[PDB]
Swiss-Prot record:
UniProt modification remark: N-glycosylated. Contains several complex-type N-glycans.
Organism (species): Homo sapiens (Human)
Subcellular localization(s) per the UniProt record: Cell membrane; Apical cell membrane; Basal cell membrane
Similarity section: Belongs to the major facilitator (TC 2.A.1) superfamily. Organic cation transporter (TC 2.A.1.19) family.
Source organism, top-level taxon: Eukaryota
Name under which the protein is recorded: Solute carrier family 22 member 11
Extracellular side: 31-122, 176-180, 233-236, 329-339, 385-391, 446-451
């Protein structure tokens, strides 16, 4: 019924249009913050510092061949081989590394030597961020009953800004990783507050649309990261450009009014009455309020079964999605083009999804799309490095397909669970999905031991979930 009241107080008003415009800004800058370390932490060609090179032929005698048929990136000859050997003439870089600055002027990987034995510290930084999202989204949820959505949006925008601008002045990796947890903690409160405010200040019909617009803004945001990176190579400038813009969003998040629904459930009808009156004034437009909102104010074995399959699918999609989006450099050599293309293939996917759904079903599409994504990830690892266009095409197909599955899952998710239980099951699924997103960047830590372990796991997991969707999900 609250949707109805809002209909009365201009749920069809301009205040919705303006609210969506204002929220498009945080949604355009969030993907840049999360996936920034694909460009700020890019791995540049590195080699041992040798006395013969830093104090073309000199390269060979100083540094041995490598497994990828190139200067080894981890060890050097103790004594120069003017003979040009045994693995015994090799020593790890005791004196450090000499990174190439041709493509990436400055990357964290060069600042804190996140190479060789430490090559896993880069994927961990991306999982400390993701954990910071999970721990944050949990805490902000608890604090949601006590504090308002608007104050939480404004604070969490400042938290992200301070912490994000501050990382540029971080002397050690521990501090960097810590200041990325704080930034992610804040971003979780932005995701929560933004969504909750937009959903709750619109009628139930427009919700599905409003969410589509927010989703499109995120896709444009991913694309824009590639562009912002192409312009700002220095990691410090990229971090400021993806963090500073939040201070402005925090100041322009004051115009927004507090969720009326929250105020009423909280217990404050007078405050709630004021906001609706204001939104209405924007739209050029107490007993009525209560009578309408009074109603609003997996134990079952079948439900237990569906829930498990759903959790397995939501975990798998996001343990493979995040793996792909956090590993741009391993996919194709041009990361800048790839990020932009990834952001673009999301829009195309959204649009294709509808036609595909017309002809087929929410279950076939999901499974088929997931399988296709897994197959694409498997193809990329197999496709030769020389054929770059093919490698890029398969990755973009993988990203698009994950987008088709994540769109289909959402529709299916809400549909399968009753309104009393939608909140519980949806929340549990999201918690599982966030755990998956924190174990996606972590499987990439295993590249050291077995290079093909990351792509093989993302591929096989996706294909396995495809089967689960096909067998244990109805329409």
């Amino acid at each position: 019924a609250f949707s109805k009241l809002l209909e009365q107080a201009g749920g069809v008003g301009l205040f919705q249009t303006l609210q969506v415009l204002t929220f498009i800004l945080p949604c355009l800058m969030i993907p840049s913050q999360m996936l920034l370390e694909n460009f700020s932490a890019a791995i540049p060609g590195h080699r041992c510092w040798t006395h013969m090179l830093d104090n073309k032929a000199l390269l060979t005698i100083s540094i041995p061949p490598g497994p990828n048929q190139g200067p080894h990136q981890c060890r050097r000859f103790r004594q120069p081989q003017w003979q040009l050997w045994s693995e015994a003439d090799t020593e790890p870089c005791v004196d450090g590394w000499v990174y190439d600055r041709s493509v990436f002027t400055s990357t964290i990987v060069a600042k804190w030597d996140l190479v060789c034995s430490s090559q896993g510290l880069k994927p961990l930084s991306q999982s400390i961020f993701m954990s910071g999202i999970l721990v944050g989204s949990f805490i902000w949820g608890l604090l949601s009953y006590r504090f308002g959505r608007k104050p939480m949006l404004s604070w969490c925008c400042l938290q992200l800004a301070v912490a994000g601008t501050s990382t540029i002045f971080a002397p050690t990796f521990v501090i960097y990783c810590g200041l990325r947890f704080v930034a992610a903690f804040g971003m979780a409160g932005i995701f929560l507050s933004s969504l909750t405010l937009m959903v709750e200040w619109t009628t139930t019909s427009r919700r599905a649309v409003t969410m589509t617009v927010v989703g499109c803004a995120f896709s444009a945001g991913q694309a824009a990261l590639g562009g912002l990176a192409f312009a700002l190579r220095d990691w410090r400038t990229l971090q400021l450009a993806a963090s500073v813009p939040f201070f402005a969003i925090s100041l322009i998040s004051w115009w927004l009014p507090e969720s009326a629904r929250w105020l009423i459930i909280k217990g404050k009808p007078d405050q709630a009455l004021q906001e609706l009156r204001k939104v209405a004034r924007i739209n050029g437009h107490i007993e009525v309020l209560m009578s309408s909102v009074k109603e609003e104010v997996f134990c079952v074995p079948v439900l237990r079964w569906r829930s498990c399959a759903m959790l397995v699918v939501n975990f798998s999609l996001l343990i493979s999605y995040y793996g792909l989006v956090f590993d741009l450099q391993s996919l194709g050599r041009d990361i800048f083009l790839l990020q932009a293309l990834f952001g673009a293939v999301d829009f195309l996917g959204r649009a294709t999804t509808a036609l595909l759904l017309s002809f087929l079903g929410r279950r076939t599409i999901q499974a088929g799309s997931q399988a296709m994504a897994g197959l694409a990830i498997l193809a990329n690892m197999l496709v030769p490095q020389d054929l770059q266009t093919l490698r890029v095409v398969f990755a973009v197909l993988g990203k698009g397909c994950f987008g088709i599955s994540l769109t289909c899952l959402t529709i299916y998710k809400a549909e399968l669970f009753p309104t009393p239980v939608r909140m519980t099951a949806d929340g549990i699924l999201h918690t599982v999905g966030r755990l998956g997103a924190m174990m996606g960047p972590l499987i990439l830590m295993s590249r050291q031991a077995l290079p093909l372990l990351p792509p093989l796991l993302y591929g096989v997991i996706s294909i396995a979930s495809s089967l689960v969707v096909l067998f244990f999900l109805p329409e």
